[PDB]
Subunit: 123 residues, 4 copies
């Protein structure tokens, strides 16, 4: 359900994700990062399964933030890939990749991997 | 650098990636997969660095495809994260994560990782 | 410290890791998996930093289990890569890759990624 | 399949991997990196499937190197997970995770991911 995804979410490090889920499967919003070379809000775009399986299956989704806004440019982009699990503790569990632009010779150290869990506060 | 990202790209397995790079960092287009539970095109959306560095560095980008269109629904989504390297032979070098919607019991086996290289040939 | 790593550990799904850290940087022991096509114990081998930085830095380590013992063969191998953090709640936080042997055409779906946290019980 | 893993291998960047595959699943040998805060050889240890499938499947394997030897200590460890494909041109296709020991504050930026392909040339 788009509505269940729409809202304000925060992860374990204190970053803020504001998102709207559109009926066509689109995700749009802003990301505020608690860590890294970042300040203020960044534009996010993603896609989610707008017709998930009933069961107790999660809803698969993903989004990207490129770390450039009008105040700073970190020359990197993070994608989060995971699933939304709806309940009375609604969570988005993800794994992420962070790639920095590098020269050809430093490209072996361009991509960080980690995982983030998001807890919903507001719609 | 910048606008050379717009175009039709192909990865090592024959999947086709058709993208438009907007001036302010948006990536929009369609993807058609050569593998998996997919048929025809799927919508993608992403972001890229619209003011990259001026030393020899690549352009950082990323995009997502949710594998649902009017024909099929695999209940999964892939994100690709990587960089664009322009030149006489431009390439987009990426690593990707494919997450399927699972029950909580099967959540440990929900995410595949791999890598794709796209060129204009 | 090798001693601090040596012991019995369990992760969030109920798998058991028994390990000895050798003074040359070697890790040897057995793994018992709570999930997957697995039964009874499997041999593990790894390496760790036997001279870590003092600070409050973790100790980097990694190990491999190939999922074949005398009772079952899953034709796969998992590597865990992470760090040991010593404290009165001693933890090993890892990220893992699980690769299955596949044909050339199915090789795009050969590798799973996830993360595991281990809590120490015994030496 | 099986014993063809023993040998000297090289990846795309010139790193050299010298391995012995034991009969019961052990991998033992040395690694010398072409990149990073490393010099000379480092000990590796791993495991592989000693009875793989008989259909067209690769041999699953994995190994770890902690980047400390008598010369240097990078306080990090890499694990490679992948499969061996034998034939006229054998290859080991892998993906890897490099974790550095960090403080708790920097734990989000502790792990790099990439991919390496090893051949006997």
């Amino acid at each position: 359900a788009e509505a269940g995804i729409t809202g304000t979410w925060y992860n374990q490090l204190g970053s803020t994700f504001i998102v709207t889920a559109g009926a066509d499967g689109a995700l749009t919003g802003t990301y505020e990062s608690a860590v890294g070379n970042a300040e203020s809000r960044y534009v996010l775009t993603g896609r989610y399964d707008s017709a998930p399986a009933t069961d107790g299956s999660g809803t698969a989704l993903g989004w990207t933030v490129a770390w450039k806004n009008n105040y700073r440019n970190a020359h990197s982009a993070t994608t989060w890939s995971g699933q939304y699990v709806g309940g009375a503790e609604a969570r988005i569990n993800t794994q992420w990749l962070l790639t920095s632009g590098t020269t050809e010779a430093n490209a072996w150290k361009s991509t960080l991997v980690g995982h983030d869990t998001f807890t919903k506060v507001k719609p």
